[PDB]
């Protein structure tokens, strides 16, 4: 997995190099590739991603969408503004709290 220490070194690298030079950023870290550095930045570390709690507008959206386009989370996600992994876990969450 990723540790606070890698994460902060990534944040600093990206903030110096920019978001298209993943190969030198991957050279800066040990046990990390450019594929993985990129995935981490665009999944969790990007300050555009929001980690708050769901407005119930957002949750009525999530439910309506996840019924209209079933199993299509990378397509659902941008229509509501969080990553596909967050949408998906929180959706299962509402489902089991409702079950």
């Amino acid at each position: 997995v990723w540790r606070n220490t890698e994460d902060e070194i990534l944040k600093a690298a990206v903030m110096k190099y920019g978001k298209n030079q993943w190969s030198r950023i991957a050279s800066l870290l040990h046990r990390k590739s450019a594929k993985q550095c990129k995935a981490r930045w665009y999944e969790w570390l990007d300050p555009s991603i929001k980690k708050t709690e769901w407005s119930r507008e957002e949750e009525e959206k999530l439910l309506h969408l996840a019924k209209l386009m079933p199993t299509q989370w990378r397509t659902i996600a941008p229509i509501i503004g969080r990553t596909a992994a967050q949408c998906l876990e929180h959706y299962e969450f509402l489902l089991d709290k409702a079950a």
């Binding site: 070194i9 600093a12 690298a13 903030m15 110096k16 050279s27 800066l28 040990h30």
Partner: protein
Amino acid sequence: GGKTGSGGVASSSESNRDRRERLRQLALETIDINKDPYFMKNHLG
């Protein structure tokens, strides 16, 4: 394609030593960029 007169490619020990040096200059940079009063390097690096 290559070029003549070159030495080889660095072994793991030299590559890792250069990685550590690069990671050090990085952090000195960002520490300045945040104008951090509170950080110091002691005599053991």
